[PDB]
Structure formats: C-alpha cells, structure tokens
Amino acid sequence: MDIKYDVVIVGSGPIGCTYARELVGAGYKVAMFDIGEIDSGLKIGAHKKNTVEYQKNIDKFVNVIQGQLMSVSVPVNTLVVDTLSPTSWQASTFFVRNGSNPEQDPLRNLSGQAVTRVVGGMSTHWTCATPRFDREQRPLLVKDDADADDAEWDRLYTKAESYFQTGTDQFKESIRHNLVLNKLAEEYKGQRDFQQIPLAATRRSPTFVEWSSANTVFDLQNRPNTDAPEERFNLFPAVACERVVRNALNSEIESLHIHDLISGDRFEIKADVYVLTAGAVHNTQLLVNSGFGQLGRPNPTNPPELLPSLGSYITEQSLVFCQTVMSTELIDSVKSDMTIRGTPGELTYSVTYTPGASTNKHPDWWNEKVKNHMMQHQEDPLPIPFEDPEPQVTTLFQPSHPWHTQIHRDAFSYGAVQQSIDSRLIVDWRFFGRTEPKEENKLWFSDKITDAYNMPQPTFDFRFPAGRTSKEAEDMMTDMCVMSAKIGGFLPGSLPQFMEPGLVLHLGGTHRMGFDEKEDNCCVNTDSRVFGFKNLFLGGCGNIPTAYGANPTLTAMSLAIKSCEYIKQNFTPSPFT
Amino acid sequence: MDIKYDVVIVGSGPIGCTYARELVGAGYKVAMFDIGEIDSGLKIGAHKKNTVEYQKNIDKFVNVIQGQLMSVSVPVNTLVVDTLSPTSWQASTFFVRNGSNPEQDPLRNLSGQAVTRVVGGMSTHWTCATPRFDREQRPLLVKDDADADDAEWDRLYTKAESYFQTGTDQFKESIRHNLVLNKLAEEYKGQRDFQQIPLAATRRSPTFVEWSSANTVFDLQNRPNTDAPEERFNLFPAVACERVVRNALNSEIESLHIHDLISGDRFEIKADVYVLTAGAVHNTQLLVNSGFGQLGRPNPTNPPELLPSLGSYITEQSLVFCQTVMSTELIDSVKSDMTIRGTPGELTYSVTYTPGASTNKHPDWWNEKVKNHMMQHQEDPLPIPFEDPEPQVTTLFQPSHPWHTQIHRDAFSYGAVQQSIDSRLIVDWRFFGRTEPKEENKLWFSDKITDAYNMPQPTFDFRFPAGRTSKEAEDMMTDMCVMSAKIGGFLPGSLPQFMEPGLVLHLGGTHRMGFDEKEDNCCVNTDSRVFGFKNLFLGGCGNIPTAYGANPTLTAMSLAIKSCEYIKQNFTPSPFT
Amino acid sequence: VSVPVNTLVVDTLSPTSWQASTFFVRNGSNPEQDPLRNLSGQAVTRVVGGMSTHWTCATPRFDREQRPLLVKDDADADDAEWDRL
Amino acid sequence: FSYGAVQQSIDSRLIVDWRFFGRTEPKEENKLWFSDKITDAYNMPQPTFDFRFPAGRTSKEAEDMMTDMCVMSAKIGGFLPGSLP
Ligand SMILES: *Cc1cc2c(cc1C)nc1c(=O)[nH]c(=O)nc-1n2C[C@H](O)[C@H](O)[C@H](O)COP(=O)(O)OP(=O)(O)OC[C@H]1O[C@@H](n2cnc3c(N)ncnc32)[C@H](O)[C@@H]1O
Ligand SMILES: *Cc1cc2c(cc1C)nc1c(=O)[nH]c(=O)nc-1n2C[C@H](O)[C@H](O)[C@H](O)COP(=O)(O)OP(=O)(O)OC[C@H]1O[C@@H](n2cnc3c(N)ncnc32)[C@H](O)[C@@H]1O
Ligand SMILES: *Cc1cc2c(cc1C)nc1c(=O)[nH]c(=O)nc-1n2C[C@H](O)[C@H](O)[C@H](O)COP(=O)(O)OP(=O)(O)OC[C@H]1O[C@@H](n2cnc3c(N)ncnc32)[C@H](O)[C@@H]1O
Numbered sequence A, B: 001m002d003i004k005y006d007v008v009i010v011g012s013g014p015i016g017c018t019y020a021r022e023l024v025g026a027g028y029k030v031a032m033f034d035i036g037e038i039d040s041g042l043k044i045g046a047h048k049k050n051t052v053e054y055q056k057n058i059d060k061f062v063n064v065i066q067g068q069l070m071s072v073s074v075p076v077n078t079l080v081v082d083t084l085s086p087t088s089w090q091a092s093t094f095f096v097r098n099g100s101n102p103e104q105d106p107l108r109n110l111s112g113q114a115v116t117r118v119v120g121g122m123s124t125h126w127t128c129a130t131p132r133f134d135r136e137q138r139p140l141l142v143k144d145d146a147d148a149d150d151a152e153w154d155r156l157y158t159k160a161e162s163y164f165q166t167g168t169d170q171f172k173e174s175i176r177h178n179l180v181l182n183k184l185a186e187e188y189k190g191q192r193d194f195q196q197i198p199l200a201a202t203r204r205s206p207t208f209v210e211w212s213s214a215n216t217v218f219d220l221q222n223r224p225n226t227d228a229p230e231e232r233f234n235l236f237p238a239v240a241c242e243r244v245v246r247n248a249l250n251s252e253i254e255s256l257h258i259h260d261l262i263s264g265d266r267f268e269i270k271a272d273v274y275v276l277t278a279g280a281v282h283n284t285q286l287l288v289n290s291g292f293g294q295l296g297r298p299n300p301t302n303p304p305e306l307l308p309s310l311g312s313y314i315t316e317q318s319l320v321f322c323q324t325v326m327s328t329e330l331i332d333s334v335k336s337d338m339t340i341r342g343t344p345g346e347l348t349y350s351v352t353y354t355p356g357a358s359t360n361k362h363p364d365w366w367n368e369k370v371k372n373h374m375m376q377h378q379e380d381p382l383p384i385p386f387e388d389p390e391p392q393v394t395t396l397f398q399p400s401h402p403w404h405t406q407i408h409r410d411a412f413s414y415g416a417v418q419q420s421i422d423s424r425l426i427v428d429w430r431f432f433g434r435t436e437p438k439e440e441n442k443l444w445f446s447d448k449i450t451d452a453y454n455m456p457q458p459t460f461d462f463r464f465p466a467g468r469t470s471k472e473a474e475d476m477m478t479d480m481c482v483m484s485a486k487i488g489g490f491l492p493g494s495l496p497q498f499m500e501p502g503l504v505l506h507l508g509g510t511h512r513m514g515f516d517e518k519e520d521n522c523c524v525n526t527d528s529r530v531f532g533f534k535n536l537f538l539g540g541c542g543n544i545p546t547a548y549g550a551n552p553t554l555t556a557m558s559l560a561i562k563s564c565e566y567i568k569q570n571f572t573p574s575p576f577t
Numbered sequence C: 001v002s003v004p005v006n007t008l009v010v011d012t013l014s015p016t017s018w019q020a021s022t023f024f025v026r027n028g029s030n031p032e033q034d035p036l037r038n039l040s041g042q043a044v045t046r047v048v049g050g051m052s053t054h055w056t057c058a059t060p061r062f063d064r065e066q067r068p069l070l071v072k073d074d075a076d077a078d079d080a081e082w083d084r085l
Numbered sequence D: 001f002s003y004g005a006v007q008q009s010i011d012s013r014l015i016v017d018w019r020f021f022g023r024t025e026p027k028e029e030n031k032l033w034f035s036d037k038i039t040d041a042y043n044m045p046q047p048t049f050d051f052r053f054p055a056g057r058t059s060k061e062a063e064d065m066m067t068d069m070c071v072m073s074a075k076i077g078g079f080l081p082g083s084l085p
C-alpha cells in the first residue's frame, strides 16, 4: 500500500466500481478500500448466484442473501420469556442485550434495513432489476429545459446499461413468463404496458444466466497487469475507512483514516480526490464521524452548520408482496392448441398439434415443448416443461399507477421448507412505492453507542409520511390484489402484506443531491460534489433526493458517471511511474 | 487440462486434500476435480467463517451453512393445501413435484442428509471438532495385536492433527468455557473427565479464530509455482466426475469420465492411480454409476457380484440437542471474589477484589475482567465480559457413556430472529450416538430417477437398529437432560429433542473398510484400496465400518494418510518434465 | 365431519419409540376420504339447540336470484309468499 | 370466531373483521355419501365428501369476491398482520 494516490474510493459495490471503471480507464492512480473481504470466487466482486450449483438449487440462494444482511438498528428486545427454569438466571429488566441499540424507538424504525460488508457489496446477491426512472421520479440534472434534462439522462442511462449489461430479452422463451405477461397485457386495455423487467444479466444457456454485479462493471483485479499494463488500481479488502480529514475552511479533504482489520493497525492515506461509495447508511456514518452534520440525537435548537441536510429527508420505499398459484384457465391455455386423447399413462394416450396452423394460439417452438413434455412425462399433470425459466414481468411506474412492479420469481423468501405447490405454478408479486422526502425522517448516529466496528451506531427516526405517500401505499396494495387476481389466487402462506420497513433496501436521500445547498435542502451538487469541497464526492442511492418507486441502482450509477466526468474535467492524473 | 496424470483425485474436501498434500509433496503429477466452484475468497477451499464480518456477526453464519446443504433424498410431499382460491390450478394427486424422489419411503429416510458442492467441500463450513476415536469406536488396522494397532493409530492421528492444526488450548481464557467445564468436572466425581473439544483452529486474537479447512491441509494452488517449483498440481472446479472405467477383470481402472459444467463438454482422463473422495454419498453414487454394486431397488434374489457390500451397513449417528440458560448460581459464582457495595449506576457503587488472596476462587486475570466489566458497564446486569469467547466443552465417549458430547456454541441453529435471552447465558448441548452397522440399512440409487446432475438419484432405506443402538440413543437423551441440568434449565424453543435423521452429517459405512471382503462384509482394505483393483482407492467417512459417536473426519483423514503411504510404496511418480 | 388419513411425517421420534411403517388409519380418520376433494372445515354440533347455541345470528333474506321458487310462474305471488314467511 | 389464543397487540377498537360469502352452483358430481364399512362415533355410516368448487361461474365469482374484499376493505384500513386476505 502506498501513502499517496490520485483517487481513493471507499466501497467496492457497483457504485464504487463505476468510479473505478471510469477513472482507472482514464489513467488515474486509484486505490479502493472495502471493509469486507473477497468472497465470490476468483472473479472478484461477482454475483454469488453465478454458480452451477445455485442455478440448479435456486431455492437455496435465499440463505446466502440472509447470511450477508446485517441489521442496521435493532431495538431493545421486550419479549417476555417466563418459562425459564427457576434455576436459570432471569432478567429483572429489559436491558441492552445482543447488539441492540438503546437509542432506537422500535416504533419509528426501518427494522428491515441491513448492510452487506463483502467485496462487491450488495451486488454480490441482488436481483439485478435496472429500470430507468421517468421524469416524475427523477432528479433534475438541467434546471429549466426538460428536453436537455431528458437528453442528459438518456446518455447516462445508456452508458450505465452498458456497464451493467442490462437487457430485456433474456426470458423471451419462457412459457411461464409469456403466460403471465400475455394475460396482463390483454387485461389492461392498452392503458398499462407490460414488458420484461430490465435485468443486468446475460443468458449463457437455457438453464444458466450470468447475473451482473460489481465485477461486471469493473473486474477489481490489481493493475498494472498483462491485460491493462498502463492502468493503476489497487483493491484493499478488510480495511475499515473511519474518517476523512477536513481542512479548517471545509474546502478540502486532506487525508483518509483507515483501520486494517487483519493487522489491527491504523493508517492515513493521501489522495487528490476522495470518493465515498460505502452505501446510503455508511456514507452518512463516515461523514458524521468526520464532523459533518450532527453527532447524536437530533436537536433543532442547535442545528449543524456543516451540511445541515445530511441524514434528513431520508426515503425508503413501501413494499407489498404476495405469491400466486397459476389459474386453471391459464394452465389450460398453455395446451390450447393440443388435441389430447385418452388417459395419461395408458397405451392409447396421445397429444398432438398441427404445426403452423392459423387457428393455433402459440408458435411451434411453444407447442413442441408442450407436446414433448406431455408425452415424455405422462406422470406429470402440468403442460409446462420442468426447466422452463421463471417469469420476469413489469408494468413500470406511471402517473396513474405510481409504483414499480415486479411479477417474477425472486431468490429472496424461498425460506426453509420445500414448497408443497409445484414451483411452475408460483409467481411472486412485489410492488414498490415512492416516499416523499420529509425533513423529519432521519438517519442519525449515537454519540455513545457504537456498532461492531466501533463506529457511531446508526439510529432511524422514520415514519412513512401521512399524506400522498400513505394513500399511494395503500392504493398500491389494492392494485397488487386486483392485478394478481388475473393470474391466480394467493398462495397460502404468502398472502398480501407490507414487508418490514426497509427490508426492500432501497433507502435514499441520506446525502441528497440538488442544485443549491440551502434552497434544495441538500448535500451534493449535480456532479455529486459535496458543497464547499473541491475534492470530495459521494456516490450511491443516498444522492437520490426524489420520491422514487423503481429500483434505484441504475440511477445511482448514472449519477456516478456524471460525477466521473467532472473529475476528469478538473483533476490531472499523475504520470505513470 | 492434460489427458494423463499420475494421480487423479475426485473431490476437494479435506479428505481429497489429504491425498493432495501427501502425493503432491511426494512428487506425483496430480489432478483434482470438483463438481463445485471456488468459493471462499483467495484462499482456495478455506473456512467461510474466517471473515472479520462473520466473527463479528456469528449469528449469521447459520445461513451460509444452510445455503450449501442440498438435501440428498426428499420424499414426495403430501401436505394438504385446501385454501387455494377456486380459480387456482389444484392437484388431483400428490404427484412428483419440486425435486422430490418418488423412490423414497418418507418413513425410512435420512431426511436431514445433505451434500455440499463447493471447493473444499463441507470443510468450508464445519464446526472443526476433531476428536480421536477410542478402541471401542475404531476399526482395526492390525488384526491381533492391540498395542500395534494403538501405535499405528497414534502415529496417523498425530499426523492428521498436524494437518488440521488441531489444538485444545484456544478457549482457555473464556469465562463461559470455564464456568461450564469447571462445574461439570466437579459434579462427575472423577468418573467422567471434561476437557476442551479438540478443535482444528488457531486463535489469532482474543476475538478472532482462524478455523481450519481443506485449505489448511493443502492450499489448492496450482503447481509448479514460486513456492513449490518442483511440484505438479492442477485443480479443476465445475467438473462433474461421472464414471470410472473398469477393465474386464475388475482389476484396474482405465479412465475417468468427466463433464465440464461450464462448456458442457465431456472428456476422459487417464491416471495411474484414481482416488475417490467425493463424500460418503457421492463416492457410492459414482461407483454404482460405474457398475459396482447394484443399480436400482435392492433385490436379494439377484445380489451383485461386484462389491456386494457397497451401500449396505450404512451408519448415521443419532443426535440430541438442546440449549440451556446459565444458572443463577453459576452467574453469581463468576463474581464470588468481589466485594460489591451500593447500587449500579449510583455515585457510591463499587466492585473490588483483593489481588492474589488465598480465599479467592479465581485467578487475577479473571477477577480483573469481571471488575472492569462490572464497573465500566453498570447498565449491564451480568458479570461476564461482552467479548468473552464461547464454551467448547466435551466429555469424550466411554464405555459407560457411549456417546460423544459437545457443550458449546455452534454456528448452526441460530435461526432467524434475535435471541431475547442474553447470548452470554446460552450453551448448546449436542450428544452423538453410535449406530450398529446392519446389512438392511442401505444407500441405493434409482435406475430411472436422476438428480440435478443427471446422475442416479440417491435413496435411503434406513432405520436406527432396534436393540443396543436404540437403547443407547434414549439413554443418551436422558444423559443430556441430567448433565445439562447442572448448568441451567432448558432455553424455551430449544428444548431436548432428537434432530432429523442425518442432519448431523456423520454418515459412514457406505463403502466400508475391513481385512477381508467376504468375512468383514466390506469394500476397501486397510490401505483403502478397493478389493480386486490395483489402482482404485476410496477416502472418507464412507470407509469407517464401526459404530462411532465421535466426529469422524479426523479418523477418515488418518485412514487417508495410511492409504497414501501405500500409494507411495507401490507407484512411481513420473519424471518432472 | 370427515377427517382424511394423516400423512404428516414425524421423523424426530426417539429410536426407542414405536414408529409407524405406514400411514394407517389413526385417531378417527376416515379412510374413504380423498383429502383433495373434501370439505375439511365441515363440522357438526351435538347439543340441545344445535348450532344456534353458538351462531353469529345474521339473518338476511335472500333476493330472488338466490332463492328457490315457491310459486312456479308468477314472480309477484312468489315474492308475496316469501315476504309473508 | 377467530379471536384465537394470544391477546391482540393492536387495540381492539381499531380492528374490523371482513367475511365475504360466495354462492356455489349445484352440480350433480358434488356429493355427500356414507361409507358401507366405516362408522362414526355413534356407530352410524361415516360421512364422506366428494366436493370441488365448480370451475366456471362459481370459481370466477369466488376470486372476484376476494378482490372485492381487498378493494372495499382498503377504504377502511390496511390488513391486520396475521389476518391477511
Ligand atoms: C441485498 C439486495 C439488494 C438489492 C436487491 C436484492 C437484494 C437481496 N435487488 C436489487 C435490484 O433488483 N435492483 C436494484 O437496483 N437494487 C437491488 N438491490 C440493491 C442494490 O444491491 C444496491 O442499491 C447497490 O448494491 C448499492 O450500491 P453501492 O455501491 O452504493 O453500495 P453497496 O453495494 O452497499 O456497497 C458498499 C460497499 O461499501 C463497503 N463499506 C461500507 N462501509 C465501509 C467503510 N466504513 N469502509 C470501507 N468500506 C465500507 C461495504 O462493505 C460494501 O461492499
Ligand atoms: C456441514 C457440516 C459438516 C460438519 C460439521 C458441521 C457442519 C455444519 N461439523 C463437523 C465437525 O465438527 N467435525 C467433523 O469431523 N465433521 C464435521 N462436519 C462434517 C465434515 O465437514 C465432513 O465429514 C468432511 O468434510 C468430509 O470430508 P470429505 O473430503 O470426505 O467430503 P466433503 O467435504 O463432502 O467433500 C467432497 C467433495 O466432493 C465433491 N464432489 C461430490 N461429488 C462429486 C462428483 N461426482 N464429481 C466431482 N466432485 C464431486 C463435492 O463438491 C465436495 O467438495
Ligand atoms: C357454528 C356456527 C354456525 C353458524 C354461525 C356461526 C357459527 C360459529 N353463524 C350463522 C349466522 O350468522 N347466520 C346463519 O344463518 N347461520 C349461522 N350458522 C349456522 C346455523 O347455526 C345453522 O344453519 C342452523 O343452526 C341450522 O339449524 P338446524 O336446526 O337445521 O340444525 P342444527 O343447528 O345443526 O341442529 C341439528 C340438531 O340435530 C341433532 N342431531 C343430529 N343428528 C341427530 C340424530 N341422528 N339424532 C338426534 N338428533 C340429532 C344435533 O345434536 C343438533 O342439535
């Protein structure tokens, strides 16, 4: 490790890797630190679902996700256990136990909020949905010219889509995908459009998809190397970044304090440019530990002079979920072109279709799959092939329906026991609401309590705002109930419900963007530069200042690309030496 | 990849790595294949619990284990779901769904049996307990000379302990460990001895333990390399090994058929020596798919001519579990040397001890820890420091108590919700029974049904034998109830119970060892050579032919060392070229 | 009314406990009953007063659409008969 | 009905139950029959059902009914966790 770099990046998630891809490519001497370690095999920071074994056992990947989601703020537990043996030591109070945060009001929390500390961040396990935001959900990059704003976002999103390898074609030959999409498309009378979820992924075979990740964006190999002999990049895992050192004027960062978790030793690293991409929670934590904002319980009587909007106006999406069991009508529709005679398993049974007939509702590729499955597996009562890929359907956020939708199969909440209902019948429904930014909704950090890395303990003070946000959230629930019914009834044990606040992991606005610090109640400008500072940039969903329902990562990446352009325009790389 | 090696090893678990360590070191040109992929970071095949983040969040590692335990044989599901919507497609029968095995009697299964397909095998997640077996549990290596047999086992176990870095000192400064061990030691009136569980692990700091794994045994890096320029080793992950090719005489293996899971292509690999270390289930599967034993449902009327004992005499241990909440008496004992005056949190409160006093029950290191914790954390009602390591206690199997015991904290069954009871109070109890080998207890492979890798589907026909095994299992349960009571009452939700058969993952005897194929009803000799074959060896717990309660891996490793000695005595490495 | 034969797998019995080899008829179950074509929730009450000793007491009338005819070809007469009753 | 077993954590004054009841088409195939071998607790022929909700109007309406409860209930409040539709 050197003591001086051109650029230091904190965090090796997909957003930190966006900065690495852009700036390593442009010739900067870059160092990247991550508190977590190299996990994913020899492709550093890659998607953990890209093993042959997981894609043959997709029901097991939920466990991998759960194993790297560490809760942000757990309130003191008040469950009464009164069936202990009289001999066992028994509490007299509900004291602070087992990592709980005594600052946390359990009734004003994001209990589901969690963080992932591994190289590649949450992109080692994510669902890879990368929709664009429409104007209604999106911050302005150009103030008073909507066409210019549109053109800027189109350019950035197109580049981000390339970095992530976003596509909308990978599930086109799925019978289940078609069954669902086709039904919904026909039922909404032209007024809501259904398409494939945009997914950061490349199909390699009919039963394997290479899901994208941080590694897709930037391979995280140290440089120079044979393939990039004139690039300069070092990744340092197991390094907790603790403090950026401000000058007196709050115009420059002069150093980064790091803690090597293997040796235990602490160091300071100099750079020309500091980029914080540690996640929406941990960017904020690092800044607060560095003297930005206000440490401790908020108090308006003494509001912070440095970045007063930091940790305020936080947003998290409402999330509703259910699963459905495909309707009899839809299952029969799969085989509607078949002539079926006799009884399965008996000598005289047959399933035939007429290739190319005009009366057929499906193309030959579909009917071949169905016929062969029905004839070769007469023990099986469904017409859907066993290896048929999952549905991946959305109708995107619109004014009339201001929520994102995913009608799909997610690796999350498989759970623990095998499904009794055939998997080919099951479809997940996830609708995601937008949350109004409100000053009262805060992420703050204790001045006494510390987390597992001896850093100020995060605490939420959050409620979904009472007006539009709440009305829309409940309307969203209703919409999922109505729309899902067109596909099938609810699966027992996966009935319509709101998920624990924050379990969705789409937190934004913790270090939010705008044009003017005071007027727009914000922390970074449109180049993601922290107001007042020449050389400090923040990347991630914490920059997004708007109420958004769609998945935020692509938007955050687009903002990071724009920020890198600024850096390239304003800092000279050091000579390669 | 070459088409010819001196030695081919199937499986990169700790047993395959024992063969690699011994034979790569001795100058053989070695190839190793694993169906699974490089997981554990840059230390190939290492323990996944060796991240800073897991050892700060030990409650989360259960998820990692669950995520790589793929059930061996799941019977057809017969749960009645009668609350589907009338529109949903509804089954008329309990048909084969969701990977279930229609060959499997649900009432004669090892439902908990599972396999792990990752480089390093189950050693990437295991608990690292490596006790020796006493004579009663151990197969003979020398037939009619107990002293010679003892000396052979001592030599092999000592080497295996070195390979694994087994020790019994890593938890000596734990207050909780001491509290438990000291109490039990005093209560058994000299007739049962308590010691630390022997653990394959090296402590690096008071809050970090480097758990051993396959990587400890052999680092799995390709050779030649800078550190080993005259060694020759290649690891090939994502390669399913499907068949060994027998000659007509069943005296030699002529080839190994492999399937590259990335390209999809199939190849054949030649070696002088073939070693199968794919686990107790998958060794058996590979052999059966190669024409050993009998494919399909057993039928005595047509018993196999080649290795007729293969897949018979299988053993799995009964496992009983509970957790306890430490007694008030034990908690008060922690602070017995303290003079405590006043009320915690008040001006006049104090906790003192007299260093070096003869009346003290504890040494100064203990009383310093307790005093500082009690004075610095007056909000906390327990005298045990927050970072105190976990207990790791055993009384080893003996004739009078023929079960292994672990009195400890295991990463398995943390579960899902935070504990309401303080973790410092909680102790896990796992007692492990020995199971008599019986011919009727079988692992067999379907001639029609295939698993996810298109290999014959494993099916169990197992019941715990009715006599000694069953009497001992129930006596073992009682013993855990009696012994645990000395420490505290049961923790609600972790009451004394038998675990699902096979969840313990200590299956043995599937390809068992003995001196004479017919007389000892066995498959390999004491060099782990398959009877009749010059060049085929099996390694792993499937070799162990006895009823054993202790954890089998160290014993299996010892047998593998002996097998490697035979190979070194009988095959010449090729010239380094 | 009709409880099908139970097929829940209990595989954590102690080895000493008597363990079934089949899903035999146990505990009042009806071996005639297909569990997948049942009214599993159907039940009966055998006490004086019947189910009216516990019911919710909701007593709506049926409109024509739900109601059997008491008069065959005169809807007004049918309505008048039902209103009276 | 369905108070259950544990005290409600949510204040009872806030809680409203929703029960929507569908109509089922009479179909000859839907039967209540009695075993000629198996007997009930009063030594009478054991009742057995052979029932499925009919596939057409009955089923369409049942699912539309579910939707209607979801839509209508929303006007009053969100679902109570543990008592989801
Ligand atoms: C968990 C998850 C997330 C997810 C999702 C499904 C699941 C189960 N599905 C998504 C989807 O379909 N579409 C989408 O847009 N997002 C989805 N997500 C969320 C997505 O993964 C995140 O939005 C994205 O990963 C955020 O990227 P970012 O690069 O900003 O942050 P990160 O991935 O959390 O990585 C941050 C890294 O910083 C390291 N760290 C944290 N603190 C420090 C300190 N102090 N020092 C050094 N390094 C630090 C972390 O270890 C992490 O690697
Ligand atoms: C899961 C587990 C295991 C465990 C334990 C706790 C848990 C949660 N605690 C233990 C303990 O405290 N003490 C002990 O002695 N054992 C404990 N275990 C069990 C232990 O992990 C196993 O006994 C040991 O790992 C067995 O070693 P072995 O090398 O024989 O087998 P393996 O680890 O299962 O690895 C086999 C490899 O073979 C590959 N494979 C399988 N099939 C194929 C084919 N056809 N082709 C190529 N490769 C194959 C697997 O992928 C695996 O890596
Ligand atoms: C249980 C229940 C029922 C109920 C309800 C809520 C509950 C929890 N809420 C209702 C409501 O709001 N509105 C409504 O219209 N009905 C509601 N119900 C159903 C209602 O209680 C029943 O429809 C009504 O009680 C039926 O009356 P009926 O007089 O026809 O039948 P019964 O109450 O079941 O009584 C029958 C008696 O016969 C005796 N018995 C049975 N077998 C024999 C033989 N072989 N020999 C002699 N006596 C016999 C029974 O013991 C019973 O008392």
Ligand SMILES: O=C1[C@H](O)O[C@H](CO)[C@@H](O)[C@@H]1O
Residues within 6 Å of the ligand: A127, A128, A129, A406, A410, A411, A412, A430, A504, A505, A506, A551
């Ligand atoms: O972005 C998302 C959120 O963070 O996770 C959900 C469940 O995995 C995903 O379905 C969704 O794509």
Ligand SMILES: O=C1[C@H](O)O[C@H](CO)[C@@H](O)[C@@H]1O
Residues within 6 Å of the ligand: B127, B128, B129, B406, B410, B411, B412, B430, B504, B505, B506, B551
């Ligand atoms: O060897 C073992 C078995 O395989 O797993 C148990 C739970 O992890 C362990 O406690 C035990 O050490």
